Amino acid sequence: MKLLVVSWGDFERWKETKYRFGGETSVGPSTLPILQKVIKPDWTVIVLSDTIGKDFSSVETLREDVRNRVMDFLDRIGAGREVDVIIAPGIGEFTHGSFRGSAMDAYYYVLHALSEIIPTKGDLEVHFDSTAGLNYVTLLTYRALKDLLGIAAVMNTVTFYAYNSDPFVPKITKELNINTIETTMVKPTPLSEPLPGFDEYLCPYSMERAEFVRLKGSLNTLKNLRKEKKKLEAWIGSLLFGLPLLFLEEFPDIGRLESYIEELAETWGGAIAVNAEEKAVTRRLAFGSGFGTLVKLLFQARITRGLLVEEPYSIEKLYSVSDRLFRGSTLQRVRVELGKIEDKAIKYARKGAFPRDIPLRDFLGFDAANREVSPRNVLAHAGLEANVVEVSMEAWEPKRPEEEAGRHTHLKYTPVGLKKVEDIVSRALKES
Amino acid sequence: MKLLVVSWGDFERWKETKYRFGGETSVGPSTLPILQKVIKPDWTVIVLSDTIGKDFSSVETLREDVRNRVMDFLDRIGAGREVDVIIAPGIGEFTHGSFRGSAMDAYYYVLHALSEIIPTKGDLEVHFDSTAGLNYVTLLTYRALKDLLGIAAVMNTVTFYAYNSDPFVPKITKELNINTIETTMVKPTPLSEPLPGFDEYLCPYSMERAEFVRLKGSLNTLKNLRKEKKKLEAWIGSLLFGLPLLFLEEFPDIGRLESYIEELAETWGGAIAVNAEEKAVTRRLAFGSGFGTLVKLLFQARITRGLLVEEPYSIEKLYSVSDRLFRGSTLQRVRVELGKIEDKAIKYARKGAFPRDIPLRDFLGFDAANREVSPRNVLAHAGLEANVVEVSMEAWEPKRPEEEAGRHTHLKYTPVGLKKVEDIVSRALKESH
C-alpha cells in the first residue's frame, strides 16, 4: 500500500509554474497532480495550518471555512477523491485573524490525525512533500510521520521518500524539478518511553490554575490511567526488551485507549475560545507528551493486534509471536529460553509425565534459596523467570514428543509473579 | 557542553522586528542574539545555503564571499564571533547566479561538517533554531543533527531542544514569540546500516561515463573497503546485538576511516565546475549513502574509542565495556553470559587449577554434540559461543577467588572462530536492514 503526504501553507497565493518529476512534466500552482500522476498513491493526506481561516463565528465555522477553500482548490487541479485533509492548529497574529496557543499542539494534533489514517496492516511506501509548507508545520509533520512509521516498521516493511522542489524564484523561474531529498527504509523502533506524571496529558495554556485542577479532576481518563499505567508500561517493555508472554498477558484494550484519546481530544477542542468580534481563537489547553505517548501506544497496539493469540499461551504460539515481534540477538535469546522449557516438556512427555500447575523453577528442577525475583533474571530470560511463571502440560498419548510438546505445554505468570514483573519492567522502562 | 545550531535562509532580506524568549526581549532582524543571551551556548553553528554567494570566479571565492557576508551580519546584530559557518551545497537558478547538483548533497555535507564539530566526549545539550531557514535545508540539518546525536547518546546523556518563531506577516507584527516545538531526551541509536555496494559512495550527477569510471577507479577507499567491509560490519553488529568481545577485537582504525571520508570529500569538492563568465556552479559528483554510513561509523568509533584497551581481554573489562555500551535485556543477557564463564573460573581456581589457551566448550564442560557454529548461539550468548572463544586463566594464589577470577580470566576469538562470527554478525546486520 502506497501513501502520499504534503505540507501546505497559503495554497491560494501560489503562481502557475511547470514541474519535472520521474520522466513527467505538469503545469499548475502545486506539485500534487504530478506527484499523484507518477507515485500513483493508494491514498493522499494534506496537512494545512488552520491560520488561513477568516470566518470567526466559532470553531466549526473556521474548520469549515478552511475545508471549503481547500476542497475548491482540489477540484481546480483535479486532486481526485482518495484524500484526507488535516486542519492542524497554527498560532500567530495574521491580517484577517489572531491564533494563540502552545506551538507543540500542531505536532500532537497531526500525530493523532496521522495515527487514524496510516494503515496498520501490510507493507507501507510513504511519499512526503515539503515544497509549499510552513517551516515548523512541515518539521512537526515530518517528525510525526517518522515517529508512527517507526512503530509500523516493527511488524511490516516501511520505505519513506521526502521531496522538495527547486526554489520557485518568481522573476527567473522557467521550470522547477521535484528533488528527492530522502530515500530511507524505516527502522523498527518500538515505543520506548514510559507514561509521564498525570501533569503532562493536558496542560493550561491560558487557563487560571484553579479552573485546571477542576477539569483535570473530572476527566475519567486520568483516573483510569492511575490503575492501568503500570500494566501499559509493562506492555511497552514487553516489545522493547523481548518478553513475549508479557506482551500477550499485558496486551492493552484498544477500545479503552480509543476512549482515553477521544476524551483528551474533545476536552482540548472544548477549551478553544473563539471571539467572533476580536477575531481571536485561544487554545486554553495544550496537549502534553502523555497525549503523544497514548497515541503511539494505541497505534503500536493496532499494528500488533494480529499477534494476540487465543489462550492458553503455548511454547509453539510464543515462538510464533516471537518470530514476528523480535529481531537480532533479542529473537535468538527468546528462542533459546523457549527451547529450554520445550526440551524439558519433551523429556517429561517421553516418560509419560504431564505436570499441571507447577512453578517453572520446579519444572526445570531448581536449587532452593534462589526465590528472589531479580531485574537481571526477568530481563535476561525473556521474562520467563523461574519464580514468576507457572507451567501446565495437557496430558496426551505421544508418538513424536519433539513436535507435540510445543503445542501441549502452556505458560502463564502467577498473580504474585505478574505484579513483580510489571514493577521490574515498568522501572526498567523509566531508567530506560 | 551546550550547542546552539541555527538554519539560515537569505539573512540580508530579513526585516527588523521584536523577539520574546525566556522572559528577555530583543529588537533586530535575527533570533540569534537573544538565543545566545538566554541559552548561553558553549559553541554556535550557523547552517546556510551556497545559493547566497554572488561570486563565480572560483569555488573558494564563493565560500569566503558567503562567510564574509555572514561575519558582517554577526557585527550588524549583537552576535558573538565564536561560531562555525557550514556553507551547504544548495540548488536552483537565481538572478545573481546558478547552482546545479544532487539535492541530497546538503544532507551529506552538513552531516560530515557536524561530525567534525559535535564533541565526542561529555554530555550534550543541543538547541536547534529553525526560526527562518529554508524548508529542505532545515529538514536535512534536523535529520543530520538527530542521526549523529542518536549515536552520541550511546555513551553520553544528550538533550535536544528545537525552536521556531511566530510566523511574520508585514507590519501587523509587533513582537514574534520564539516557541519550543520540541524537547527530547535523545535515545541511544547505534549504527544499524551495513556498508553499501561501491556504486553508493560517489555517483555522477553531470559527468561523462568514462571520466566518472576513471575517478571511481582512482579511489583508494573503494579498493580498501572491499577487503575491510566485513570487519567494519562485524563491529557495527557488535554494538547493535550486544557482543562486547567482538566490539574490542574488531575496533576500527580511526586513521583509515578519516582517510576514506577525506578522499571521498576531496574527490567531491574537486568535481565542482564553477564557470566564472555565465555565473554557474555544477557539482558533477553526488554523495551516496555509503559516504553517510562512513561519517556515522567514524563518529560512533570516536564516541566509543575511550573503551578500547590492549589485547589481553579480561571478563572484568568485558563487564565494564558492556555496562557503558548496552542497556535493558541486552545488558542483562551479557552479564549472565560473563557470569557463567566467571563462576566457572572461580570453581577452577578453588581447585588451584588455571587452564590456558583452552576452547570455551572444554572450559564450560560441553558434550561433543554441537561443534557447528550457528547464528542462534553466537547472537543468544553475547558472541561468547563455545566453539569460537578461547579461555586463558592467568595463574595466581587465590584467597577470595570470587572477586579475583574476573581480572585473571581472559577471553579471545580463535582465528577460525573470529571469521565465523564476522560472517554471522555481518549477515545478521544485512538481514535486519
Side-chain angles (χ1 to χ4, degrees):
Chain A
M1 182 278 176
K2 296 179 289 176
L3 173 71
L4 163 59
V5 177
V6 305
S7 180
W8 278 18
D10 202 326
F11 55 88
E12 276 161 351
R13 305 155 139 190
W14 296 342
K15 312 283 72 159
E16 296 251 318
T17 324
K18 71 142 49 172
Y19 288 113
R20 278 162 70 181
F21 183 53
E24 283 291 355
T25 184
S26 196
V27 195
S30 97
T31 64
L32 184 43
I34 188 162
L35 280 171
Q36 288 188 247
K37 192 184 167 92
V38 176
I39 291 159
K40 256 76 148 222
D42 284 289
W43 199 269
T44 297
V45 185
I46 309 175
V47 181
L48 300 118
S49 181
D50 71 340
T51 48
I52 66 171
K54 286 184 193 165
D55 286 39
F56 272 85
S57 105
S58 85
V59 183
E60 62 261 36
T61 33
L62 268 165
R63 296 216 145 76
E64 162 67 344
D65 179 35
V66 170
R67 195 168 137 70
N68 279 349
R69 312 220 259 86
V70 164
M71 292 306 306
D72 293 338
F73 183 88
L74 293 182
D75 211 331
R76 177 148 92 81
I77 40 76
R81 326 180 181 245
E82 284 157 43
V83 162
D84 272 318
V85 183
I86 300 167
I87 308 131
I91 63 147
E93 308 291 312
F94 291 65
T95 42
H96 304 278
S98 158
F99 302 74
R100 296 158 180 200
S102 175
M104 269 183 281
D105 282 351
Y107 166 67
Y108 292 123
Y109 185 103
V110 168
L111 181 72
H112 176 31
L114 273 171
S115 82
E116 285 192 290
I117 299 156
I118 299 160
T120 63
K121 231 81 166 185
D123 300 335
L124 299 182
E125 175 172 307
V126 175
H127 299 268
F128 178 67
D129 189 33
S130 45
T131 41
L134 269 258
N135 217 28
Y136 79 66
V137 160
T138 303
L139 197 51
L140 295 180
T141 308
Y142 174 78
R143 171 140 71 94
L145 252 173
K146 279 310 203 74
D147 292 344
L148 289 167
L149 293 181
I151 294 160
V154 163
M155 282 296 278
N156 299 302
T157 310
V158 183
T159 53
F160 176 88
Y161 305 86
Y163 310 101
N164 198 316
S165 74
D166 301 328
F168 170 55
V169 44
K171 53 170 153 194
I172 160 171
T173 295
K174 291 157 186 179
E175 61 179 3
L176 300 171
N177 213 67
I178 304 305
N179 315 332
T180 304
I181 64 165
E182 181 171 357
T183 181
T184 58
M185 166 103 170
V186 176
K187 283 133 183 30
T189 65
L191 191 43
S192 68
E193 57 187 347
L195 288 168
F198 300 118
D199 208 59
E200 315 189 287
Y201 294 79
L202 291 169
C203 295
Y205 177 65
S206 60
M207 189 159 67
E208 190 266 307
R209 221 192 147 288
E211 197 197 338
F212 178 54
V213 167
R214 295 260 289 143
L215 297 186
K216 168 153 94 168
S218 62
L219 299 173
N220 283 317
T221 289
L222 292 208
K223 302 319 177 210
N224 285 344
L225 277 182
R226 182 149 287 105
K227 163 88 89 197
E228 296 180 16
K229 177 186 203 296
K230 202 196 290 293
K231 283 206 177 294
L232 291 170
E233 288 175 336
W235 189 73
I236 290 173
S238 77
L239 274 99
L240 186 67
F241 301 138
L243 320 172
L245 178 62
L246 190 68
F247 168 78
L248 288 175
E249 282 202 25
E250 298 286 4
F251 196 96
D253 186 341
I254 283 176
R256 179 164 282 279
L257 289 173
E258 270 174 343
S259 79
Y260 294 166
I261 287 160
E262 186 168 72
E263 199 193 40
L264 298 168
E266 79 202 359
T267 292
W268 168 80
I272 306 175
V274 188
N275 188 306
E277 294 163 42
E278 293 196 58
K279 317 216 82 186
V281 169
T282 299
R283 314 204 186 77
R284 300 193 306 128
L285 281 187
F287 290 121
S289 52
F291 184 76
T293 306
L294 283 170
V295 168
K296 288 168 192 170
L297 168 50
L298 167 56
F299 191 73
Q300 188 164 286
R302 289 199 208 271
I303 275 292
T304 63
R305 75 188 306 161
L307 296 181
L308 186 58
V309 298
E310 189 176 350
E311 75 181 2
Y313 307 138
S314 74
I315 304 291
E316 193 194 57
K317 286 169 180 169
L318 284 172
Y319 272 130
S320 178
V321 164
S322 295
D323 283 348
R324 287 301 314 278
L325 206 51
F326 308 128
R327 302 151 298 279
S329 51
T330 305
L331 175 54
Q332 302 307 322
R333 293 198 292 264
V334 177
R335 293 185 65 76
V336 162
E337 291 304 320
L338 293 173
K340 288 256 174 74
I341 303 168
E342 189 178 27
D343 283 4
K344 214 65 177 191
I346 293 166
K347 165 178 172 176
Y348 282 123
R350 288 205 202 269
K351 302 182 177 181
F354 312 101
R356 307 193 53 268
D357 309 315
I358 189 175
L360 182 57
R361 59 180 293 94
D362 294 337
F363 193 75
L364 295 176
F366 266 36
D367 288 352
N370 280 141
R371 286 163 173 268
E372 286 199 53
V373 184
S374 48
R376 184 209 217 216
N377 285 332
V378 165
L379 290 178
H381 293 297
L384 301 177
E385 200 264 354
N387 301 299
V388 302
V389 174
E390 177 174 311
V391 194
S392 299
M393 296 179 66
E394 50 161 334
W396 84 97
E397 297 163 27
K399 293 143 194 169
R400 290 188 185 282
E402 327 94 63
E403 306 286 2
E404 288 144 8
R407 304 172 210 125
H408 293 82
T409 311
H410 316 307
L411 307 183
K412 51 162 168 178
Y413 292 107
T414 64
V416 167
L418 180 61
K419 306 325 174 290
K420 289 190 190 297
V421 169
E422 280 167 5
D423 289 337
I424 281 166
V425 171
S426 181
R427 177 59 59 76
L429 185 64
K430 291 182 196 190
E431 273 163 38
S432 74
Chain B
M1 162 61 189
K2 296 192 173 98
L3 191 59
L4 171 56
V5 178
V6 306
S7 171
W8 275 15
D10 205 336
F11 59 98
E12 269 158 13
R13 273 178 51 181
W14 298 340
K15 316 296 170 210
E16 290 216 327
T17 176
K18 303 166 212 150
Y19 286 116
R20 322 285 288 188
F21 191 66
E24 292 293 345
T25 185
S26 166
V27 78
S30 198
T31 72
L32 182 52
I34 188 170
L35 279 169
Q36 290 180 324
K37 258 163 216 153
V38 175
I39 296 161
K40 284 313 309 287
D42 295 301
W43 201 248
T44 309
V45 171
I46 306 171
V47 184
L48 78 162
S49 170
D50 256 344
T51 59
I52 269 49
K54 275 135 61 189
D55 203 315
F56 308 79
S57 81
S58 90
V59 298
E60 61 255 43
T61 212
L62 203 152
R63 286 204 169 140
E64 202 62 39
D65 183 41
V66 171
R67 188 179 302 282
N68 282 327
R69 304 252 290 288
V70 165
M71 284 303 109
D72 292 328
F73 191 78
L74 296 187
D75 294 320
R76 180 145 87 77
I77 76 190
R81 266 196 159 204
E82 241 179 326
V83 74
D84 273 342
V85 195
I86 295 163
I87 310 164
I91 257 58
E93 274 90 36
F94 295 71
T95 56
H96 56 265
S98 183
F99 311 76
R100 298 152 214 145
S102 178
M104 291 187 278
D105 278 355
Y107 170 71
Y108 294 117
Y109 188 88
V110 167
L111 181 80
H112 170 62
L114 286 164
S115 84
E116 284 185 6
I117 289 170
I118 300 164
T120 66
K121 279 285 214 292
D123 295 352
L124 305 173
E125 177 185 324
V126 189
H127 300 255
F128 180 61
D129 189 61
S130 59
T131 189
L134 326 192
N135 240 224
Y136 97 100
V137 178
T138 295
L139 264 177
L140 295 182
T141 302
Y142 179 83
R143 195 147 78 79
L145 208 38
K146 279 314 188 70
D147 286 333
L148 290 178
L149 293 183
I151 297 174
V154 170
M155 283 291 285
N156 306 113
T157 303
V158 180
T159 61
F160 178 87
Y161 305 94
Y163 309 99
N164 196 106
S165 62
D166 293 341
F168 173 111
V169 188
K171 287 219 104 167
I172 287 77
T173 308
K174 286 161 201 166
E175 41 185 34
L176 300 178
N177 202 81
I178 311 174
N179 322 310
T180 310
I181 56 161
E182 189 176 342
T183 92
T184 296
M185 303 177 284
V186 178
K187 294 307 302 173
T189 68
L191 198 50
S192 60
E193 305 162 11
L195 284 158
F198 303 107
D199 287 324
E200 320 206 77
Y201 295 83
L202 285 169
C203 321
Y205 182 63
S206 190
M207 186 175 285
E208 300 292 337
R209 192 207 60 84
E211 174 62 13
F212 171 64
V213 153
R214 191 194 62 79
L215 277 171
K216 193 174 162 287
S218 75
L219 287 173
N220 287 334
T221 296
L222 273 39
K223 294 186 210 303
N224 302 340
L225 208 46
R226 210 168 304 274
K227 222 70 75 192
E228 208 179 321
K229 196 164 178 297
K230 204 181 282 289
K231 291 199 176 286
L232 291 176
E233 286 176 349
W235 189 73
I236 286 160
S238 80
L239 274 89
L240 195 71
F241 296 136
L243 318 176
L245 181 56
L246 193 63
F247 170 79
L248 294 172
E249 290 221 4
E250 300 284 14
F251 199 93
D253 192 297
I254 277 161
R256 275 207 307 286
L257 292 187
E258 280 177 351
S259 217
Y260 299 154
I261 286 151
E262 196 213 330
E263 192 195 41
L264 295 174
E266 285 322 81
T267 309
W268 180 80
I272 294 171
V274 58
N275 310 352
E277 178 208 316
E278 68 275 43
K279 309 191 280 194
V281 181
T282 307
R283 315 212 185 79
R284 299 168 51 245
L285 289 182
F287 284 119
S289 74
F291 182 76
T293 307
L294 272 170
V295 164
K296 288 179 198 165
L297 176 47
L298 168 60
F299 193 75
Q300 184 162 282
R302 282 197 198 287
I303 284 292
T304 62
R305 82 188 300 170
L307 297 176
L308 191 60
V309 283
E310 270 181 331
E311 214 160 2
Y313 308 117
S314 66
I315 280 177
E316 184 192 47
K317 181 43 165 161
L318 292 168
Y319 270 129
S320 70
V321 164
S322 298
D323 279 53
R324 280 309 293 282
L325 292 182
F326 310 132
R327 312 151 63 84
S329 51
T330 302
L331 171 58
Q332 297 309 324
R333 184 80 243 160
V334 175
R335 294 181 60 77
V336 165
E337 287 309 314
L338 295 174
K340 285 182 195 294
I341 305 170
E342 188 176 32
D343 284 357
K344 189 46 89 295
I346 295 163
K347 187 168 213 167
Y348 271 90
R350 292 180 199 282
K351 296 185 171 79
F354 308 90
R356 247 179 212 72
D357 305 55
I358 182 180
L360 180 54
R361 56 177 296 107
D362 296 349
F363 192 79
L364 290 186
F366 270 27
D367 298 345
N370 222 59
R371 281 200 181 280
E372 76 199 345
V373 183
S374 59
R376 170 196 170 92
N377 286 330
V378 167
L379 295 186
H381 295 284
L384 306 180
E385 203 272 347
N387 307 306
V388 296
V389 177
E390 184 171 299
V391 194
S392 300
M393 287 191 72
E394 205 177 24
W396 80 100
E397 278 157 349
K399 55 149 182 166
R400 307 166 73 76
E402 41 262 286
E403 303 142 41
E404 288 151 37
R407 302 192 299 271
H408 291 100
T409 314
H410 308 297
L411 307 182
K412 104 167 108 53
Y413 289 114
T414 62
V416 168
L418 179 54
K419 184 176 179 181
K420 280 178 159 71
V421 174
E422 286 172 357
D423 289 329
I424 285 155
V425 170
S426 180
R427 175 147 47 255
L429 180 64
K430 300 171 98 184
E431 269 169 11
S432 72
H433 199 97

